[PDB]
Amino acid sequence: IYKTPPIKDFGGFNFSQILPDPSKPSKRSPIEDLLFNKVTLICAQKFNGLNVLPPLLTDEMIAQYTSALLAGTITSGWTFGAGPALQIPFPMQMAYRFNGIGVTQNVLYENQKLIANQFNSAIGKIQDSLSSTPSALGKLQDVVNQNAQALNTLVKQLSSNFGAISSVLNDILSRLDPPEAEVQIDRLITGRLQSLQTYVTQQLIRAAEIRASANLAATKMSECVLGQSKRVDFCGKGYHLMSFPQSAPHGVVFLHVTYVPAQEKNFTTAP
């Protein structure tokens, strides 16, 4: 676990929007706070065997992990993944990144203020971009909605009778003698077992899908945040420079900081 220094001078770069806020009672940043606020019948589930087991890693622990990763990236570049952490001023780190892209590093030193202002404004925009549209986080609400709908469908389908005389077995038990009832209870048992089989199969398939998504997220985190990737359109759109992670309920959010040319002038060439 790495900790940011008390002083926050980075040669014109401002990181207030993503580092944790010591003032808030919870140890989380503003973007994480908006995401947490963004994402949101029960007392029949707990009366029919259905239960939910609380997760191990509480979200404050996740926030601590993300803060450690962010501090390491800020104050170490990328050498903290390959081995021992080695500090380096931020300006030279950005110079090395620009050199990695294919542009000689002097262009950063000449135009440092412009790049710092663009960086700060670009991060400032994203808060409004998230706060405006309410359907940005649909991919996260989707899984919760589908799980709840499926489980509620099961507890609803409990109601059918499967061809027996009555839908509740206590009625049959208190209404007929045993050796005749042993015929009607059988149909209910068979049908309900079939329902459980189908539900478990659906859950297994969905879990496989989520595992695939989690593995993709792990690869993206390893090869974007901890370093720099030459793969086209893998770490963001355009030429990739660096990345920042953020937490979210049952999810993760990536902010890729990328570089792209704007104005063009054409000339005559000669091989």
Partner: protein, 98 residues
């Protein structure tokens, strides 16, 4: 000696000294070897339908025909798996030509 329930600890906190005119450079190096393990194949399998449910009987040979063609359906899936295993190992271990 007994059992304790406590709160997690994520590791040893270790800050780094930051400054605007200082870096750190390593002078020595180490060479290491790391092991990784990955599964490839699962054992092929095949199942007979009639001989399992009602092997060595005759009334079941009449009764089962009423239900349908489940016994034909299952073997196709199992055959697909059997071929898939060979395809997997061929893909993994045949990257070289000479």
């Amino acid at each position: 000696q007994s059992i304790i329930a406590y709160t997690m600890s994520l590791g040893a906190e270790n800050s780094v000294a930051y400054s605007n005119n200082s870096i750190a450079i390593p002078t020595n190096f180490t060479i290491s070897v790391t092991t990784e393990i990955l599964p490839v194949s699962m054992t092929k399998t095949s199942v007979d339908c009639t001989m399992y449910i009602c092997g060595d009987s005759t009334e079941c040979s009449n009764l089962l025909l009423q239900y349908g063609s489940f016994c034909t359906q299952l073997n196709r899936a199992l055959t697909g798996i059997a071929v898939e295993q060979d395809k997997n190992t061929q893909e993994v271990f045949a990257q070289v030509k000479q």
